[PDB]
Design an enzyme around this catalytic site. Structure first.
Site, PDB file in Angstrom:
ATOM      1  N   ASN A 275       0.814  -1.224   0.000  1.00 43.75           N
ATOM      2  CA  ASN A 275       0.000   0.000   0.000  1.00 43.75           C
ATOM      3  C   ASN A 275       0.823   1.238   0.000  1.00 43.75           C
ATOM      4  OD1 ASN A 275      -1.547  -2.075   2.191  1.00 43.75           O
ATOM      5  ND2 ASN A 275      -2.636  -1.465   0.334  1.00 43.75           N
TER       6      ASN A 275
ATOM      7  N   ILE B 283       0.735   6.785   0.224  1.00 47.32           N
ATOM      8  CA  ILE B 283       0.167   5.782   1.188  1.00 47.32           C
ATOM      9  C   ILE B 283      -1.296   5.602   0.837  1.00 47.32           C
ATOM     10  CG2 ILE B 283      -0.340   5.192   3.587  1.00 47.32           C
ATOM     11  CD1 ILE B 283       1.778   7.343   4.382  1.00 47.32           C
ATOM     12  N   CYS B 284      -1.706   4.415   0.415  1.00 46.20           N
ATOM     13  CA  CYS B 284      -3.125   4.097   0.180  1.00 46.20           C
ATOM     14  C   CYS B 284      -3.681   3.652   1.553  1.00 46.20           C
ATOM     15  CB  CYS B 284      -3.188   2.954  -0.831  1.00 46.20           C
ATOM     16  SG  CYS B 284      -4.882   2.437  -1.117  1.00 46.20           S
ATOM     17  N   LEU B 285      -4.444   4.521   2.171  1.00 52.05           N
ATOM     18  CA  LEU B 285      -5.017   4.323   3.467  1.00 52.05           C
ATOM     19  C   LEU B 285      -6.305   5.112   3.558  1.00 52.05           C
ATOM     20  CD1 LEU B 285      -4.747   3.128   6.363  1.00 52.05           C
ATOM     21  CD2 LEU B 285      -3.450   5.249   6.967  1.00 52.05           C
TER      22      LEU B 285
ATOM     23  N   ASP C  55      -6.216  -3.604  -1.896  1.00 50.82           N
ATOM     24  CA  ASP C  55      -6.145  -2.168  -2.166  1.00 50.82           C
ATOM     25  C   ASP C  55      -4.793  -1.842  -2.715  1.00 50.82           C
ATOM     26  OD1 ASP C  55      -8.228  -0.578  -1.465  1.00 50.82           O
ATOM     27  OD2 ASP C  55      -7.433  -0.023   0.570  1.00 50.82           O
TER      28      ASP C  55
END
Length: 149
Positions: free
Chosen positions: A79, A86-88, A119
């Site tokens: 991620n 940052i994929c969050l 994701d």
């Protein structure tokens, strides 16, 4: 505006009396809206022993929009990409004003400990995480040695 600045100062004071995980964060110099953070690689994760730096930019309408948060240290993770993006979910669609920079750092620490490979920002890292955990961990340890020590 003034509301943002009040809230930023409050969260800085909160973080100093109660540090999230083994993280540090605060202003770069005198600029309250631009912070640096550090996160220690969690013990018993493949990042153990690494120190990872991050940049944070607070928006002018904080806390009603999320801070922009990116890694500056390279890291092997499903991620987090080569730009440190940052994929969050809480940094985008799931942000709300009851979140704080301490809670963002605790969520990023948990993310390091337990990725979201469905994701994927880095499709191959997500794939290896899912299909060969022992290999994912080996390579993440190698990249911790290479970049984060």
């Amino acid at each position: 505006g003034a509301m943002a600045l009040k809230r930023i100062h409050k969260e800085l004071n909160d973080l100093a009396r109660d540090p999230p995980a083994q993280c540090s964060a605060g202003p770069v110099g005198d600029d309250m809206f631009h912070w640096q953070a550090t996160i220690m690689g969690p013990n018993d994760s493949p990042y153990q022993g690494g120190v990872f730096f991050l940049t944070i930019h607070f928006p002018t309408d904080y806390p009603f929009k999320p801070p922009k948060v990116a890694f500056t240290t390279r890291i092997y993770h499903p991620n987090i990409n080569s730009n440190g993006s940052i994929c969050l979910d809480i940094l985008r669609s799931q942000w709300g004003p009851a979140l704080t920079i301490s809670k963002v750092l605790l969520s990023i620490c948990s993310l390091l400990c337990d990725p979201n490979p469905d994701d994927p920002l880095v499709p191959e890292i997500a794939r290896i995480y899912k299909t060969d955990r022992e290999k994912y961990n080996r390579i993440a340890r190698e990249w911790t040695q290479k970049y984060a020590m």
